[PDB]
Amino acid sequence: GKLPPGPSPLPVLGNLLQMDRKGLLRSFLRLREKYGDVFTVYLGSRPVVVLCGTDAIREALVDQAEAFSGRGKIAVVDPIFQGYGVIFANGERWRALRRFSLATMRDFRSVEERIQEEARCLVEELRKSKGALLDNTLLFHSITSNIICSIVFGKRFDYKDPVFLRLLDLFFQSFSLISSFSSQVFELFSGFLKYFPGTHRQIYRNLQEINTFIGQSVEKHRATLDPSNPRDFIDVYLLRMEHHQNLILTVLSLFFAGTETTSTTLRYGFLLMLKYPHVTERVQKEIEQVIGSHRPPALDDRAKMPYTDAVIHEIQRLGDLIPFGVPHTVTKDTQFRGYVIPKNTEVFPVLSSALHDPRYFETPNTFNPGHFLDANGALKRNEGFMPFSLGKRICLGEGIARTELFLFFTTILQNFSIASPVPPEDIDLTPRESGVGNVPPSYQIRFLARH
Amino acid sequence: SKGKLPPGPSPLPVLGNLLQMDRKGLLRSFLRLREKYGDVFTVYLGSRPVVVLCGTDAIREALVDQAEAFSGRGKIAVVDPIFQGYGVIFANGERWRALRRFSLATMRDKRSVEERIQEEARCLVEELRKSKGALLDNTLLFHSITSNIICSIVFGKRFDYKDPVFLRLLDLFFQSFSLISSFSSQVFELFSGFLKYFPGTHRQIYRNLQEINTFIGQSVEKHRATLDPSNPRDFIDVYLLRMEHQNLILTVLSLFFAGTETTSTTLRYGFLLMLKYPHVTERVQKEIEQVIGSHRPPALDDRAKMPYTDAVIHEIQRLGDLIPFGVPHTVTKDTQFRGYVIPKNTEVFPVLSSALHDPRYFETPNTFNPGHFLDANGALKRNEGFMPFSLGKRICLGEGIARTELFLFFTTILQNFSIASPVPPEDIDLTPRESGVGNVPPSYQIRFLARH
Amino acid sequence: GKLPPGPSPLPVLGNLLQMDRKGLLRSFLRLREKYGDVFTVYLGSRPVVVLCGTDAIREALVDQAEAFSGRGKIAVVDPIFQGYGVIFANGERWRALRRFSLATMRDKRSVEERIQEEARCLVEELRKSKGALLDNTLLFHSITSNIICSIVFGKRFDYKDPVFLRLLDLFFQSFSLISSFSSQVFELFSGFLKYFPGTHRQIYRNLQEINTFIGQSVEKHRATLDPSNPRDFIDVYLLRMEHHQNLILTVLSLFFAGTETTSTTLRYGFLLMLKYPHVTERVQKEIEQVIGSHRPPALDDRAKMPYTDAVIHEIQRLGDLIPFGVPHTVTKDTQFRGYVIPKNTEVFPVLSSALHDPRYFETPNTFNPGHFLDANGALKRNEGFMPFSLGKRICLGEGIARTELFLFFTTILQNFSIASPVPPEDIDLTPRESGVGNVPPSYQIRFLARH
Amino acid sequence: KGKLPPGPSPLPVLGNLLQMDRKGLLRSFLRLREKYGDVFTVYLGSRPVVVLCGTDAIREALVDQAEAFSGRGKIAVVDPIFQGYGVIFANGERWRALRRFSLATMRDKRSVEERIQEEARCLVEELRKSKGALLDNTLLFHSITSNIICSIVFGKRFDYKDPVFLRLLDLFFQSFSLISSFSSQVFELFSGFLKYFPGTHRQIYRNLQEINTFIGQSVEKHRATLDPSNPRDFIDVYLLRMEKDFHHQNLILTVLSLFFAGTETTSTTLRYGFLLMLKYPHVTERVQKEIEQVIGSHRPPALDDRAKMPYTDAVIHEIQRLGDLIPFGVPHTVTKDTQFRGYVIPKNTEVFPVLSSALHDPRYFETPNTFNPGHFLDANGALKRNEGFMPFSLGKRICLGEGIARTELFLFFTTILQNFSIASPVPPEDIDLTPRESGVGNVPPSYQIRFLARHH
Numbered sequence A: 001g002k003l004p005p006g007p008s009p010l011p012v013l014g015n016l017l018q019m020d021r022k023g024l025l026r027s028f029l030r031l032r033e034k035y036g037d038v039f040t041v042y043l044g045s046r047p048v049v050v051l052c053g054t055d056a057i058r059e060a061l062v063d064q065a066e067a068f069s070g071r072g073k074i075a076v077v078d079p080i081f082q083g084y085g086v087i088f089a090n091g092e093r094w095r096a097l098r099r100f101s102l103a104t105m106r107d108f109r110s111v112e113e114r115i116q117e118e119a120r121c122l123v124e125e126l127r128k129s130k131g132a133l134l135d136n137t138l139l140f141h142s143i144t145s146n147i148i149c150s151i152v153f154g155k156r157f158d159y160k161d162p163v164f165l166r167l168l169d170l171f172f173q174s175f176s177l178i179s180s181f182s183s184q185v186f187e188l189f190s191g192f193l194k195y196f197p198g199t200h201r202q203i204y205r206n207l208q209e210i211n212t213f214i215g216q217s218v219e220k221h222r223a224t225l226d227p228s229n230p231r232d233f234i235d236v237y238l239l240r241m242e243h244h245q246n247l248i249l250t251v252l253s254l255f256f257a258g259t260e261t262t263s264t265t266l267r268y269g270f271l272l273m274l275k276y277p278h279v280t281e282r283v284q285k286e287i288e289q290v291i292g293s294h295r296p297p298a299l300d301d302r303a304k305m306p307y308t309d310a311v312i313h314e315i316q317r318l319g320d321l322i323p324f325g326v327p328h329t330v331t332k333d334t335q336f337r338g339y340v341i342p343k344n345t346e347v348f349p350v351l352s353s354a355l356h357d358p359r360y361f362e363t364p365n366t367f368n369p370g371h372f373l374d375a376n377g378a379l380k381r382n383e384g385f386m387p388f389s390l391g392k393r394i395c396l397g398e399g400i401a402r403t404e405l406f407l408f409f410t411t412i413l414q415n416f417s418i419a420s421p422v423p424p425e426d427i428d429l430t431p432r433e434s435g436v437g438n439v440p441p442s443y444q445i446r447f448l449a450r451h
Numbered sequence B: 001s002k003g004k005l006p007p008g009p010s011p012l013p014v015l016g017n018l019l020q021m022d023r024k025g026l027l028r029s030f031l032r033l034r035e036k037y038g039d040v041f042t043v044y045l046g047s048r049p050v051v052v053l054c055g056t057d058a059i060r061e062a063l064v065d066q067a068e069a070f071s072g073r074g075k076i077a078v079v080d081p082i083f084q085g086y087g088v089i090f091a092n093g094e095r096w097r098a099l100r101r102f103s104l105a106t107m108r109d110k111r112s113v114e115e116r117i118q119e120e121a122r123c124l125v126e127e128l129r130k131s132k133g134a135l136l137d138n139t140l141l142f143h144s145i146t147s148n149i150i151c152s153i154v155f156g157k158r159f160d161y162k163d164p165v166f167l168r169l170l171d172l173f174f175q176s177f178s179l180i181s182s183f184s185s186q187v188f189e190l191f192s193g194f195l196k197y198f199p200g201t202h203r204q205i206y207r208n209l210q211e212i213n214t215f216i217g218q219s220v221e222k223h224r225a226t227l228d229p230s231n232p233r234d235f236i237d238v239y240l241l242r243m244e245h246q247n248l249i250l251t252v253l254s255l256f257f258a259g260t261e262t263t264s265t266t267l268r269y270g271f272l273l274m275l276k277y278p279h280v281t282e283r284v285q286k287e288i289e290q291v292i293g294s295h296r297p298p299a300l301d302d303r304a305k306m307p308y309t310d311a312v313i314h315e316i317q318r319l320g321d322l323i324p325f326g327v328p329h330t331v332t333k334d335t336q337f338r339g340y341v342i343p344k345n346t347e348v349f350p351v352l353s354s355a356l357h358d359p360r361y362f363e364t365p366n367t368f369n370p371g372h373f374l375d376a377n378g379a380l381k382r383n384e385g386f387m388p389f390s391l392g393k394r395i396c397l398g399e400g401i402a403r404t405e406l407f408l409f410f411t412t413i414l415q416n417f418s419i420a421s422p423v424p425p426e427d428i429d430l431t432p433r434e435s436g437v438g439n440v441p442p443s444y445q446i447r448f449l450a451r452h
Numbered sequence C: 001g002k003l004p005p006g007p008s009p010l011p012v013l014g015n016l017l018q019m020d021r022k023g024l025l026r027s028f029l030r031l032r033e034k035y036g037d038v039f040t041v042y043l044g045s046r047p048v049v050v051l052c053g054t055d056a057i058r059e060a061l062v063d064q065a066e067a068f069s070g071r072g073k074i075a076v077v078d079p080i081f082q083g084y085g086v087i088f089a090n091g092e093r094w095r096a097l098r099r100f101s102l103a104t105m106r107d108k109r110s111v112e113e114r115i116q117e118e119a120r121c122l123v124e125e126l127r128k129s130k131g132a133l134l135d136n137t138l139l140f141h142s143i144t145s146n147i148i149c150s151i152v153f154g155k156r157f158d159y160k161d162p163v164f165l166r167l168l169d170l171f172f173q174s175f176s177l178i179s180s181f182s183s184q185v186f187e188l189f190s191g192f193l194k195y196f197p198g199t200h201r202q203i204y205r206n207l208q209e210i211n212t213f214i215g216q217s218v219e220k221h222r223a224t225l226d227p228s229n230p231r232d233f234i235d236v237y238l239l240r241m242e243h244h245q246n247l248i249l250t251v252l253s254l255f256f257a258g259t260e261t262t263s264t265t266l267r268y269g270f271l272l273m274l275k276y277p278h279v280t281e282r283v284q285k286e287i288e289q290v291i292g293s294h295r296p297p298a299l300d301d302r303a304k305m306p307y308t309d310a311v312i313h314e315i316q317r318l319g320d321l322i323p324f325g326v327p328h329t330v331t332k333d334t335q336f337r338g339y340v341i342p343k344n345t346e347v348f349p350v351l352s353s354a355l356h357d358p359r360y361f362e363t364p365n366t367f368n369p370g371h372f373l374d375a376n377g378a379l380k381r382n383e384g385f386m387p388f389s390l391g392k393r394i395c396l397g398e399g400i401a402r403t404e405l406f407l408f409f410t411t412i413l414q415n416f417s418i419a420s421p422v423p424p425e426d427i428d429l430t431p432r433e434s435g436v437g438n439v440p441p442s443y444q445i446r447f448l449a450r451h
Numbered sequence D: 001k002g003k004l005p006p007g008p009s010p011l012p013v014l015g016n017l018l019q020m021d022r023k024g025l026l027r028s029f030l031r032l033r034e035k036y037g038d039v040f041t042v043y044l045g046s047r048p049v050v051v052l053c054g055t056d057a058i059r060e061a062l063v064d065q066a067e068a069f070s071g072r073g074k075i076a077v078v079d080p081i082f083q084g085y086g087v088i089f090a091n092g093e094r095w096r097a098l099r100r101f102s103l104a105t106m107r108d109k110r111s112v113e114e115r116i117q118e119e120a121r122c123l124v125e126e127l128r129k130s131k132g133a134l135l136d137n138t139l140l141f142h143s144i145t146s147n148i149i150c151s152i153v154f155g156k157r158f159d160y161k162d163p164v165f166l167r168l169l170d171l172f173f174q175s176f177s178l179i180s181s182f183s184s185q186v187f188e189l190f191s192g193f194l195k196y197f198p199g200t201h202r203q204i205y206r207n208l209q210e211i212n213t214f215i216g217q218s219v220e221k222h223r224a225t226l227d228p229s230n231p232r233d234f235i236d237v238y239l240l241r242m243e244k245d246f247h248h249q250n251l252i253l254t255v256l257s258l259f260f261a262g263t264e265t266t267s268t269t270l271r272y273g274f275l276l277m278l279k280y281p282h283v284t285e286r287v288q289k290e291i292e293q294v295i296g297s298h299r300p301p302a303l304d305d306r307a308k309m310p311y312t313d314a315v316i317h318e319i320q321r322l323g324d325l326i327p328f329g330v331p332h333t334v335t336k337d338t339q340f341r342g343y344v345i346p347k348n349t350e351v352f353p354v355l356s357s358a359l360h361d362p363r364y365f366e367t368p369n370t371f372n373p374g375h376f377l378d379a380n381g382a383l384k385r386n387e388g389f390m391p392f393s394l395g396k397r398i399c400l401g402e403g404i405a406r407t408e409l410f411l412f413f414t415t416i417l418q419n420f421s422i423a424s425p426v427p428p429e430d431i432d433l434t435p436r437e438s439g440v441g442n443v444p445p446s447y448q449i450r451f452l453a454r455h456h
Ligand code: HEM
Pocket: A254, A255, A256, A257, A258, A259, A261, A262, A263, A265, A322, A325, A326, A387, A388, A389, A390, A392, A393, A394, A395, A396, A397, A398, A400, A401
């Protein structure tokens, strides 16, 4: 039982100076070459244990799922200040949400239908653009947001509805925090980071208006409600409950954060498909063969479209939008691969390192739907595929998201083809911002009706 | 109420008190809470309590009267002996103390800091002539002049303003880069228990790091061969002496540059004020006259004979309020404070902005007013609410070097120049472009016209 | 979410002054009347949560088995001083022992055979006493000890073998620690107790000799031994063998502590049977009807003797030899009957209060085999019967001990009858020492050969 | 650099228990010391305790790092989750107050010295009533020292046969025993819990409520009579503090208990003292002669006499040094990560300051194991300090009773020998001063002695 090996940390800086000018991801890869799949790295004076590769990450998040399932200190209540009670009530709330979330996919109106409706409204908008050159960011935030809106408030919004615009602004609107390296070293010496959520005034711009809107919908909802026949999330909340309107803000927030990842995946997907017209075609042909140019694509179609499915896996794999996964905390002294990780140690499951694992993918860095296709061109599981993560806290939205990706993706290409000022050979898929995320470069595209 | 915890607004699950902030910023938000709950109250960031200290009296009772209890660092800076053993822990203690002590030699002592500043002051005057009265942004200039003081002290000699090592080092330490967030991401961070932002996530930083590091290696060498006690030529060979790992120097340099940046920004703010108040620039120009003539360069001993220029610099620091929430600390033991109890390890914000604007100590908290530091006979007077370097066990290690830079740079500049800008006094706006945890002065233009 | 209610503690003394002249057990009962089945009591400045009644003890030890399974601070390794490693190894050792113990019960000779053999050697000894008045303490320690010797060393000892006498002395020989109330108050104020194991010099009297004997047996064992013929625990140890001998000393220690309880249960059992001769008769008659006076009793007989079984249950229930159970520790913040018990809080499962639960026994305080018999005089389960405790840490020896109690009790009474200077009406079953235990009064008894 | 203190490798469950001698814990610790040095780590169960040996180590810990080594054990630590803070600070204020009230000097209704002097006279009288018979002085010594506390607390001394006083002697001083076996002890270690805890013995409650009641009445009677500024004793000091303002009468029980625990050690010191003096008649004589030269046979000894009697003083020091009644000191707890002699002791580590090892430090006493008044006397026969002398411990928690106790030892000891001489059946060569058990205590063997009136 030794602790995981790693580079020796400096006082105050930890291993900060052992990062490449080439990025955090490369640095992690370099460390991994040196020390192996489980190594320890120091941020400030704090140890974090870093998991790399499909096998290590799956042994941790799946085989010792419970041990590797803790949250960060920011999310741990102090019973000396708040009592137990909020602790247990949060537990129950979480489980209620974890449960209801599953229910939407099983039911039952249905999520597939709401997404189909939304895809229709989308195709219509794309015609209105009459093949002009656009940035799809806003459009893709809109179509994925509405799926949440329909599920929570019961009904989708209109793309130009000023509440829906205000809520797109609250949740998706960037703001930035300015730092310098001298300040960062002083933060490390302090023990405290300068930035924390809500330090930017912008956040509050739209908050109260959104809050108020929620109040109204809870009321309009309460007026008409009948268990055990709950319509949307709002009136499920009312039953469970039977101040707190803020529980809804919180849940909506969580769902929008996943939705942002969903929207960015589509936006990245369409960048890839500009770069690879031949793939756009085989997808157009598989839609022809399976759906025709008549009906809208449906979820049952996916099973009969292994090439479109492989293509979407591959879009999520290279898009790698959450490259360090979400850090967790170990809940107890844990034996792992011949080392010991002490209770409460912070862990990074580096998902990027699975999604690019050379033991699981033939060309880890090259678009290759063949990663998900067998000899007979059927869909095959690949164990390195884990963009929603794994185990006890696997993405709550996996199903909603995978479903949005399929319907929006085929429905768009069934009705349109794409083009841009940039020649395939010259599309650059490398992330503009590569810190803790992999945000796709912004680009222009034109949606031309196949009709 | 035997021993209660400090009162505060009720927190929401996950968000804490995040929705209890104003569209008008944290500082207002805090002041509002203060009105409601008093000088010591509890606020929740995520699920974590932080106890907030407001007003001169509370802040002084904590940081001074219970200095030790209020002296801890945040968790990021606490070593885990399970991972690293004790030893590094005690070594850092010793290193910190050595550095704390070394800070005073500048204080009491081959050539002096005051001298080093005067020399820098001269080079500056020269540079300003070269401007020839053109409009310029003084950011870079002020970073340069204050940075050099640290360079002279550490490497033994100042740099040339266009020396490409010094430009590279200005870039490492002072160059802004930004981290992009959204509100939905932030609420997900709170839910996670972890922040996305942490030092070094921006790739920019490494741009100049290795080059700076190598340069340090070289100076440690050139130092090691020539050097010998007890003739500590500068900080580099003070480090060699103690030592008989270069990265220890990078760390110390880093710390001094962070305080320097605040020093430079204070000057930059100071001059914006002085554009807005020409009448004060004049009384300062006049005081320098009685005191110093127009030929010799100002010296530190002049400060005691210039209460109006002193008071004016206090007042620049007060309103500049560049570290409004102080530096968060941690309580080292269960502590009784003003009728409440703060548990061991609780995080604490000493809100220095609230002492610097304390109505009980400053007649016009929000208005430039040298009278705040002057008595009836226009002599300098202590004001208790004045605490921009903080107080107590961890008072700014640079307080001396900084106060000294501010005096020599401000008087030496005004002795040789006068200032002007496209913007009419009435229209200069001193409100911080962005605050965040900072109160950053709006960028502006200014002209330095040689006096003759 | 409130903590369990209880009496207000004084500084330093805690609730010490809230105890009766009438004893700890009654004091708690008075407290239970006042506060309910779950209450908080202070020893020194430390809270301990006390569980009373069959329902609460079963809801904690069984329904939340894991949460209520922790050990006291004295048994918790500090990884700062010893690393993890010893921690995990002890976990593995414990489970290996937990396992082999169950296996042996299932099993060149069965455990039951070894107890049968020992019952024979006992019967013989009782004849050599030729009906003389004796104190059976030593005899009952001997017969139960040998069962452990045979299992660990492979073969039983001779009752006068001087190794075995030395062994009996180490493990079972009383020594005492002297205290005053003024010293005790000073200990509480100190935060430290004076007593700790091994402060009495007497312990070492026989330790090295015993240790050496173990060495020898490990050797004599290592020479001969081989699967698929493990002869006993010693060579099981050798086999899992794949600083060292002392692991046997430790296990032997543990087994002798439960053995002592077993021996004391027989000794208490025979006291009861002096007091209720008719009961001894019905037992003699059920042995007649079922075993006869020819063969030795066997374990399969027990199923066919519900009266003797019910009478042994009742002996264990009233004997109440471990009335506070063994304190445990709570492993996490726990919800329990409307309260919260914080992580690490010490917990007393007060077994005596189950064994005397008026909700489960008609006459809690009166010998009554009817507690375990139905209308047709068949054996019936009683939920308040838990003298081995319950749940994840139920007595490791439950099976060996129940089997010793049956064969030794029937085998003795099949061959002897009992008598004493004291008239039934005058036998007093109240414990001479009512500390944290319930030690039966010492007495004299004669065994007489039956005919 | 900063490694933990060295020690013997512990076994699972048992810790270092098998590394103890048949020869007792103290010898076991001395053997480890030889092997590992003055600071070493030993394991009780799975719990590390750092052991401090020698005058120098114990003084560097309790004195030079006084605060760091001043913690109490877990039993005495409040969990604020259950009790809040408040009881915690109250206790602090309470400790400090008590500490303060005790620091009044020996002479100032009337002084402690006076009370002791009075008590010595009632003692002398009792020893005459024995008319030189052979007695066991245990009860007598508990009585005389107990009374000092009674006088201080209740305002007046008790009569040696007063049935309240006999009941209180019984509550506080009466032994009871807890029976254990080694197999049970190994199981306790495995459990994580000890069977023994204060109050498991029913005997304690025999006299508790009667004592409590007595305290009630006294408080009331006191309440009736207070004329501060004319405060007679501790009872109305307590009442007075409360007045500025259960915990009510219970705080007194608790304090009384604490004082009787130190009193027991004071009484056992005298009892051990007189056993030594049977063994060394020539020392009894030089003491008798120094009492002659200094006090004469006419007045009662007074405290001011001690300064003028360096031989009696040295003899009493030596009685306390070899008596060694608290050989392991009182275990403490380290309040913070602490650098000590090149090692680190982590926050909350339990510490044994082994006072026996200072009291017998060959570096400070020429003949550590032999009675030798010379340890405290210089060349001219004047008293000299010895650094290894620390039977009340040192530092922030030095015995609260040091003054009262040293004063009782001087007045009782001189007064007795001014008025009596001593004898016993056993010849001095044959007196055996080795303590009966060796387990955290060094109880002197019981013995008989005769007190023979001197008759000037
Ligand atoms: C579009 C692709 C998406 C990806 C790749 C993704 C990925 C993830 C990942 C990596 C996690 C962290 C799992 C862990 O902690 O181990 C996560 C958590 C979560 N995601 Fe998603 N997400 C996506 C979309 C969504 C959507 C649409 C939702 C809608 C609700 C969503 C809701 C959540 C929630 C509530 C969690 C919290 C998991 C927990 O800690 O229990 N995500 N997601």
